[PDB]
Ligand binder design. Structure first.
Ligand SMILES: Nc1ncnc2c1nc(Cl)n2[C@@H]1O[C@H](CO)[C@@H](O)[C@H]1O
Length: 385
């Protein structure tokens, strides 16, 4: 029953996803708000602790006590130049506890501090409860994914987050490995298979090259930009609409925090519409000083606003190919991961760089990692018996 059941968890920087392999198929489990992905946010309020969508929806009103990006801190030392550089951009306090970073917040009127693994365990507990509500029974066995560049300390801290959350961690697997498993790329029989995983998420870009030799996976190269993702494209849209409001009304909205946030959420939504339509409309009642902002943007204009950012995704692809010592024609499969890979211009650029090659994109890219982890969790729990 419960002891023979296992889940796959994609514990992401900005979003998390949970899957279960049963009756010959993977089911990506929707949360209580009907969403197949849940924000990796934890809010501490005057009465409660919020996780996911409810935490993300109140980030504007409570920025000092809403934690996100815990994956950027997990398994790292306080003195690490990555930690020191990132701290300058977060609205929450990061403190030092014996060369280990802790996030310090106000919760139920008291000052509390949490280790990154305790923050990640609260996200994992939510993913576990989403699976339990769908299954009708508690599930405790899980496969958790990590980026392929995570070292031993980051992997151990992720496993510890799993233990705190009440999960029995069957295995910690690499995100590009879970993605290749989702597409069945490890069941092609004999001979070495070279796979490139192009992972463009909300806040990070990762390129991974894997060799699959008779079921055995090997990471040949990892490249990317830890500070490039979907949120940079939303900000390019925001800047355009701030300048358009200034041309139509002779009023600068940039300093009005509420106006910029409402514009940012509308831009994120418009950006998503632009993946399946050639135009999107913005409908913001009383954006600033009682002025409604009813406008539209074409896909062509959006592609111009982000042109330099889209083109920059090809330098890590080339860098990963030289590090792996492979030419383009030596790559057998191209796999898309992350919601931003739905952008048609991103797909066109990658396909043209690989000389008109077909892309593996039939599995929802923001769900492919949880899908593969769910498949691996089923295989592992069966062998355990
Ligand atoms: N249809 C879409 N067109 C463009 N971007 C998308 C789309 N869906 C998601 Cl999710 N994202 C973005 O992917 C990230 C999460 O993986 C977020 O930045 C989200 O906006």
């Amino acid at each position: 029953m419960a002891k023979a059941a296992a889940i796959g968890i994609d514990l992401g920087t900005t979003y998390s996803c949970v899957g279960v392999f049963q009756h010959g198929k993977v089911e990506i489990i929707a949360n209580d708000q009907g969403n197949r992905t849940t924000p990796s946010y934890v809010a501490f309020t005057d009465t409660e602790r919020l996780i996911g969508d409810a935490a993300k929806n109140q980030v504007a009103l409570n920025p000092q006590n809403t934690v996100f990006d815990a994956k950027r801190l997990i398994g790292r030392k306080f003195g690490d130049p990555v930690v020191q550089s990132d701290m300058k951009h977060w609205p929450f306090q990061v403190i030092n506890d014996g060369d280990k970073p802790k996030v310090q917040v106000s919760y139920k009127g008291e000052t509390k501090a949490f280790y990154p693994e305790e923050i990640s365990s609260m996200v994992l507990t939510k993913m576990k409860e989403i699976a339990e509500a769908y299954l009708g029974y508690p599930v405790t066995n899980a496969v958790i994914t990590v980026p392929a560049y995570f070292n031993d300390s980051q992997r151990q801290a992720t496993k510890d987050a799993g233990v705190i959350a009440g999960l029995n961690v069957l295995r910690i697997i690499n995100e590009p490995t879970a993605a290749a498993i989702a597409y069945g790329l490890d069941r092609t029989g004999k001979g070495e298979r070279n796979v490139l995983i192009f992972d463009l998420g909300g806040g990070t870009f990762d390129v991974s090259i894997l060799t699959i030799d008779d079921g055995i996976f090997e990471v040949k190269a990892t490249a990317g930009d830890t500070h490039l993702g979907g949120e940079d494209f939303d900000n390019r849209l925001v800047n355009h609409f701030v300048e358009e409001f200034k041309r139509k009304h002779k009023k600068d909205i940039s300093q009005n925090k509420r106006a910029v946030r409402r514009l940012r959420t509308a831009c994120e939504r418009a950006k998503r519409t632009l993946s399946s339509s050639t135009q999107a409309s913005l409908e913001i009642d009383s954006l600033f000083e009682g002025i409604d902002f009813y406008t539209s943007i074409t896909r062509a204009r959006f592609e111009e606003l982000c042109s330099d950012l889209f083109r920059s995704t090809l330098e890590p692809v080339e860098k990963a190919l030289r590090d792996a010592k492979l030419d383009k024609a030596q790559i057998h499969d191209l796999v898309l991961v992350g919601g931003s890979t739905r952008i048609p211009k991103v797909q066109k650029l990658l396909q043209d760089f690989f000389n008109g090659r077909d892309l593996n994109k039939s599995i929802n890219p923001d769900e492919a990692v949880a899908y593969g982890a769910a498949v691996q969790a089923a295989i592992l729990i069966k062998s355990t018996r």
